[PDB]
Amino acid sequence: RVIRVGTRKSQLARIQTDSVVATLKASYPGLQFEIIAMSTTGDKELEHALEKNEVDLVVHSLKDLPTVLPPGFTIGAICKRENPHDAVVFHPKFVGKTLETLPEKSVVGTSSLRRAAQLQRKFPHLEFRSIRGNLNTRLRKLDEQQEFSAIILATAGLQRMGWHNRVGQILHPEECMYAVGQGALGVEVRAKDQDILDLVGVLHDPETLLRCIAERAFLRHLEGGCSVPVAVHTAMKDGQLYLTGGVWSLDGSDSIQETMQATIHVPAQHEDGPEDDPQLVGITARNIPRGPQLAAQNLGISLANLLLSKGAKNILDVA
Numbered sequence: 001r002v003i004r005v006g007t008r009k010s011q012l013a014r015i016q017t018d019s020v021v022a023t024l025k026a027s028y029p030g031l032q033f034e035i036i037a038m039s040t041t042g043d044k045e046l047e048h049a050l051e052k053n054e055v056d057l058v059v060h061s062l063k064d065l066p067t068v069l070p071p072g073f074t075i076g077a078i079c080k081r082e083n084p085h086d087a088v089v090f091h092p093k094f095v096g097k098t099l100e101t102l103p104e105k106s107v108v109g110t111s112s113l114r115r116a117a118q119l120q121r122k123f124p125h126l127e128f129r130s131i132r133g134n135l136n137t138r139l140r141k142l143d144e145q146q147e148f149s150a151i152i153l154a155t156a157g158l159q160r161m162g163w164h165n166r167v168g169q170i171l172h173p174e175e176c177m178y179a180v181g182q183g184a185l186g187v188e189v190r191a192k193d194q195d196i197l198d199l200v201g202v203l204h205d206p207e208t209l210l211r212c213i214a215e216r217a218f219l220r221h222l223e224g225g226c227s228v229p230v231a232v233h234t235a236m237k238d239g240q241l242y243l244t245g246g247v248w249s250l251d252g253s254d255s256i257q258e259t260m261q262a263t264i265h266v267p268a269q270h271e272d273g274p275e276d277d278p279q280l281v282g283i284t285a286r287n288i289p290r291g292p293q294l295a296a297q298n299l300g301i302s303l304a305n306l307l308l309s310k311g312a313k314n315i316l317d318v319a
């Protein structure tokens with residue numbers, strides 16, 4: 001009767017949830033939608049409300065979701081990708097500059113091993129240091145203190161906040177390839193709740209779905225997760241799916257980067273697929289043709305094996 005949407009009580013999480021509910025309300029104007037925000041402390045917590053039928057769907061950043069969700073849960077929707085690239089926000093004293101033009105030994109703030117490793121490699125004159133907090137906290141640390149000359153953040157996050165204008169530089173893949181699933185939202189639901197799966201299925205963007213299957217199958221086959229120096233770049237053009245992937249030592253000195261492609265046409269039409277089909281890297285998309293889904297998963301596995309053949313595991317085990 002009433003679709004309940006669970007959400008973390010944080011701000012980027014609530015913004016993300018609201019944009020999804022809004023898209024669902026566009027498709028289903030005749031349906032009641034309710035947002036329930038939950039304390040994760042007391043003043044997985046979301047999954048607990050799902051299996052307990054206290055909410056019906058939960059919106060996540062796709063890169064925050066592990067490569068295999070616990071059974072009973074699935075990613076029922078991969079929404080159209082927002083900007084996937086990493087961005088730089090500069091200290092007030094350094095607006096108008098670039099990472100090349102920052103003074104040597106300027107400190108750049110990031111807690112992402114993927115970002116630090118890639119950017120140490122490409123800008124040795126800089127230092128990268130851990131910084132903590134949500135986006136508002138890191139921006140207050142950048143603005144009010146003199147410790148950091150710049151911070152690294154996901155563009156997509158600054159755009160959900162409406163803080164576009166704090167982006168000084170957007171990193172091209174030759175400087176910093178993005179995280180698996182960066183910029184795409186993922187809708188987690190009960191694996192067996194067919195009504196809600198069909199319902200959120202309207203949000204699958206076929207292209208984003210496939211490139212995020214390729215990226216997640218690549219990540220899973222390297223046995224990785226959110227916090228590892230692995231990075232990817234995908235694109236679909238001319239009927240081809242291009243997957244570029246890389247791994248880095250924490251300092252960035254050891255690296256492996258390779259690319260493969262496969263013929264995979266972006267599906268136009270929706271279909272009534274089988275309900276018995278197993279999920280792919282934690283994703284369920286019965287309304288999208290299964291073939292391209294499986295081809296995209298195969299592209300991720302292949303590249304991962306090629307990296308593994310070149311010694312990617314000994315780099316990852318040390319991280």
Ligand SMILES: *Cc1[nH]c(Cc2[nH]cc(CCC(=O)O)c2CC(=O)O)c(CCC(=O)O)c1CC(=O)O
Nearest residue numbers: 061063110111112114153154157179182183226227
């Ligand atoms: C795996 C991982 N998660 C985060 C924190 C995070 N998750 C989502 C976002 C917004 C971007 C999006 O929805 O895709 C963010 C914050 C952000 O990346 O700007 C991180 C980053 C930790 C950090 O200190 O920046 C990561 C690791 C990674 O992205 O490599």
